[PDB]
Design a protein around this ligand. Sequence first.
Ligand SMILES: [Ca+2]
Ligand SMILES: [Ca+2]
Ligand SMILES: [Ca+2]
Lengths: 211, 211, 211
Amino acid sequence: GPRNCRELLSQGATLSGWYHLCLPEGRALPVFCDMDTEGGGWLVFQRRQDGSVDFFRSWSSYRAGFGNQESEFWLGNENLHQLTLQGNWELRVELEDFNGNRTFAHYATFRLLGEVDHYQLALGKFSEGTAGDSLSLHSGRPFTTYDADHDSSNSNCAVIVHGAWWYASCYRSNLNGRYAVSEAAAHKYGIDWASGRGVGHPYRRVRMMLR
Amino acid sequence: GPRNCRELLSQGATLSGWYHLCLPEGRALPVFCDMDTEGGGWLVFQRRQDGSVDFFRSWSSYRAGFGNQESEFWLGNENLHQLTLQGNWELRVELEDFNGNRTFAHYATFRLLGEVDHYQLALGKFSEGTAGDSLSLHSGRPFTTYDADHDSSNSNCAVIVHGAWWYASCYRSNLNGRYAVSEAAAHKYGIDWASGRGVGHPYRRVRMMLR
Amino acid sequence: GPRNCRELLSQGATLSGWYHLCLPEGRALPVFCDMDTEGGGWLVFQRRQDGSVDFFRSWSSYRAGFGNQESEFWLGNENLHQLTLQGNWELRVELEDFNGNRTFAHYATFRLLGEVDHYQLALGKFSEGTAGDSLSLHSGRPFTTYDADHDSSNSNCAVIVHGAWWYASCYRSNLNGRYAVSEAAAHKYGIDWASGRGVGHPYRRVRMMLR
Ligand SMILES: [Ca+2]
Ligand SMILES: [Ca+2]
Ligand SMILES: [Ca+2]
């Protein structure tokens, strides 16, 4: 089958939805392709919109992916590593506050290193975005989870901020953070983007996507 | 190798959802099959429900289709043309107002001619429906978008009414029109069925279905 | 094709949703796999919520399955019989009252006999469950619908209680029973589990699943 969402689109798959990709190692993977936004051809690998899915999960869970196709999910670190082995994939982050105001952030490339290197983030340069840049700090850093502490803190940031991310100590972004249904409900550390609304001021809806 | 939704149902696909058809041309086509309404086997080729998708699109977009399997879409004029080359597909239109009342219109056949003929509508007679007949006028007319005006107006109906359709000068129905959440938000030209709620009094939800 | 949901999970299908299984007879079957609950790998064959789907159906409807991938459904007695002829399927029932209290029941095995045997329930022992046992009484009984009365009563239990089930002199469980949006607007007989909330006190959400 197809290697990515751009190729599905070219062959006339014009509706956003769940499609199979054939990974380089010859394995099939269900992914959500956004065929509509910004030209289309985006592979959505993370999505937050209602708090129905628990994102405070272990190393194996984040490695393999988890969640619901109808709602919230993380595609999986190993899938992201395999997809990003070859090709150049731009990252688009989409964020929406409780007022429906949408902001964005675009990076030239996105790649994850392998499990041996703790799925370390290799991020390209920030090109444009109304949300601003809150991911560059995390470039070069290992992913850490509650049961796999690899950060640069003398504590475990996954536990501290209740998430999983390429933590330093701890973050400028935490998009896999704990869901809050409004503001009054907001956590001390939530689904935050520092240079957008700042730490402790979360978003209602989030997507991360590659093309 | 299934060619439509009734075929799928015959083979035991009894739950409404997204399936793949195979076009006579050798292309796989995700479609929504309604497997219950009036015996089931309906291919839904247009849906509106929340205003999340922009429907003011070019000739090319409408030709190839656009939208979101999870929400609102147009399956695409070339797809509809290829589906309807042979066989005779009945058309059912479903309409839901802001109160939640549902009305309907049924036509004996629905077929689109090729792109060479501007995806001209060929429509059978209205048979019955509580919505009334607001499509007959459009039978025998070419499709029109903002960048390809084939209508019977001195101006471009698609631009005037902000939609795409088999426009005359301009319409009795406009189901690809601009979304409105209420009818306080209603545009002068919206998602309209003239014999139902009238021009300028839109519907919250719409589907167009063949079989 | 894969034989069950745990085999899919095993192969990297970690997001809950609709996958195809391939039955002994080679017939591909769309099913919902829950890839999370109790470690994931559950095939959900029944789901109630909202009440958008009519569950008062014929023998042949229950045989074939009906409903909506998006919402409520019954997968099909014939499907279940086919799945369940090669063995070891634990049953898990999930119940949710009108505020959001979830209850459960587990049975070691679940199997449906063929049509000639009226899709008779063959149920293993009740292992544990906060909802208590309400299905042990229906084990060994034939399925019945309004147009096929096989029950242990001088009356027609499917019509009397407005559902379809392996009724005895009717039920200790009535999960395919009529939907109540609230109590307030409950039913003498509804989506009930006697050892739980009890007859006349329905649930809002329900799933029946196999692993
Ligand atoms: Ca640390
Ligand atoms: Ca004109
Ligand atoms: Ca009887």
